[PDB]
């Protein structure tokens, strides 16, 4: 199939974003979004673009990688394969999704040149990444943290015993803007810092990812040391205050798969924060949508709760969940989090939480998540797509998460939150 064309109606269910602190912070609306693409393949070279039509009732989102309707050109690249006579073997040129099984590092469509090499033995990838516009009819201004930020980035792993696999991953992200010189009126788009930032990564797995293991036992666990320095700003500008950073950021998860269709596990991750200056605080590579199938079904989930939606910042979280599975027709998770906060002076990154914290409390909260998808046999896409992660057929899915502060919110705030999804997905 070299054309086709992926269509999605959803509706998204929103309310409060911020908790009753703020005007806005809520939708309850519907969207189509078109996706038509192009593939084509000649000799050890291919082709694809995949461009992208929305109106909605509002501004909801229509994926999980401004006007009420846009065009955008999603994906645009070129691909070689002759580089090796690996056949798992391709560098990729161009708008592209770069993915990993974590969705911790990179999870996310951008203009890329990227190395991939898959073999039985060993996997291994090397990448350079950078914004330069979102491609879209509505924004005309990159967001302030991608304008002029380079990614370097690879990873290598090798699978040591039957579905076992250790590897190293590396990431390093360089800000070369030029900071608002003091004086000048801060813009809302202008950056808050610069600076340069290495990730090192250790990570190990058991058919974490893998949904279908045949293993009753599954884990994953991952150790991430982050370090470089950053020059922050401190509306009108009087200057930044640079600093190094020196932190660390942990995953660990056990899964059961009790039988063929029913599972249960466990996890805890962190990341570091505090210190002077900020000089503690871990944060991601701003590429990550940190979604996976870690509770073993063919559904994606966030890591962090579809509503809370944490970035591993600042950030302590406990989870506990369940998922029910029937071969390919239907899959269900709930997922249970308890949120808390390193440090209890410093913010937690970015989330799907818009309000203020109290400072000196750390119970940032608790959340339970279900997700619940009906498949159907329509629309069968090829693994080699990029939104087969997703979207491998045509399917019926509700996601949702139901978020309860804790005391780290003050009064004033709502007792309960909640973002919730539904999707439906055909494919021509
Ligand atoms: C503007 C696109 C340039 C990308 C190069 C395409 C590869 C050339 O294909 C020629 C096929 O002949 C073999
Ligand atoms: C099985 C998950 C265990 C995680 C418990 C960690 C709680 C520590 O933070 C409490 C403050
Ligand atoms: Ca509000």
């Known amino acids: 199939?070299?054309?086709?064309?992926?269509?999605?109606?959803?509706?998204?269910?929103?309310?409060?974003?911020?908790?009753?602190?703020?005007?806005?912070?809520?939708?309850?609306?519907?969207?189509?979004?078109?996706?038509?693409?192009?593939?084509?393949?000649?000799?050890?070279?291919?082709?694809?673009?995949?461009?992208?039509?929305?109106?909605?009732?509002?501004?909801?989102?229509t994926d999980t990688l401004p006007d009420k309707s846009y065009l955008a050109a999603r994906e645009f690249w070129v691909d070689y394969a002759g580089l090796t006579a690996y056949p798992g073997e391709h560098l990729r040129f161009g708008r592209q999704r770069l993915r990993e099984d974590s969705g911790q590092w990179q999870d996310t469509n951008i203009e890329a040149l990227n190395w991939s090499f898959e073999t039985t033995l060993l996997n291994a990838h090397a990448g350079v990444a950078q914004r330069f516009s979102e491609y879209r009819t509505?924004?005309?201004?990159?967001?302030?943290?991608?304008?002029?930020?380079?990614?370097?980035?690879?990873?290598?792993?090798?699978?040591?015993?039957?579905?076992?696999?250790?590897?190293?991953?590396?990431?390093?992200?360089?800000?070369?803007?030029?900071?608002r010189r003091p004086g000048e009126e801060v813009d809302n788009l202008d950056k808050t810092y610069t600076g340069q930032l290495t990730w090192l990564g250790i990570e190990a797995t058991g058919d974490a990812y893998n949904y279908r293991s045949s293993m009753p036992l599954n884990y994953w666990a991952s150790a991430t040391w982050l370090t470089g320095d950053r020059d922050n700003l401190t509306?009108?500008?009087?200057?930044?205050?640079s600093g190094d950073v020196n932190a660390f950021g942990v995953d660990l998860g056990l899964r059961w798969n009790i039988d063929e269709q029913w599972k249960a596990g466990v996890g805890y991750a962190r990341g570091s924060g505090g210190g002077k200056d900020g000089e503690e605080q871990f944060q991601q590579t701003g590429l990550e949508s940190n979604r996976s199938n870690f509770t073993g079904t063919r559904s994606?989930?966030?890591?962090?709760?579809?509503?809370?939606?944490?970035?591993?910042?600042?950030?302590?979280?406990?989870?506990?969940?369940?998922?029910?599975?029937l071969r390919e027709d239907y899959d269900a998770s709930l997922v249970?989090?308890?949120?808390?906060?390193?440090?209890?002076?410093?913010?937690?990154?970015?989330?799907?939480?818009?309000?203020?914290?109290?400072?000196?409390?750390?119970?940032?909260?608790?959340?339970?998540?279900?997700?619940?998808?009906?498949?159907?046999?329509?629309?069968?896409?090829?693994?080699?797509?990029?939104?087969?992660?997703?979207?491998?057929?045509?399917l019926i899915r509700f996601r949702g998460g139901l978020f309860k502060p804790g005391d780290a919110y003050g009064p004033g705030t709502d007792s309960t939150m909640h973002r919730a999804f539904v999707d439906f997905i055909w494919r021509f």
């Open 300 to 325: 994606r989930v966030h890591r962090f709760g579809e509503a809370f939606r944490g970035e591993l910042s600042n950030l302590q979280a406990a989870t506990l969940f369940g998922s029910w599975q």
């Open 1 to 61: 199939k070299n054309f086709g064309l992926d269509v999605k109606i959803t509706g998204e269910s929103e309310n409060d974003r911020d908790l009753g602190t703020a005007p806005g912070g809520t939708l309850n609306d519907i969207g189509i979004d078109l996706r038509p693409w192009a593939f084509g393949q000649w000799g050890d070279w291919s082709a694809y673009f995949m461009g992208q039509a929305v109106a909605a009732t509002d501004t909801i989102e």
């Open 138 to 179: 509505d924004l005309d201004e990159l967001a302030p943290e991608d304008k002029d930020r380079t990614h370097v980035f690879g990873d290598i792993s090798t699978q040591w015993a039957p579905h076992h696999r250790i590897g190293v991953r590396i990431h390093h992200a360089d800000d070369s803007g030029h900071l």
């Open 235 to 241: 509306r009108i500008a009087t200057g930044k205050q």
């Open 336 to 394: 249970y989090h308890k949120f808390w906060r390193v440090d209890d002076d410093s913010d937690i990154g970015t989330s799907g939480i818009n309000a203020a914290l109290q400072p000196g409390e750390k119970d940032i909260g608790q959340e339970l998540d279900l997700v619940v998808t009906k498949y159907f046999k329509q629309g069968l896409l090829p693994a080699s797509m990029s939104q087969y992660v997703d979207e491998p057929s045509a």
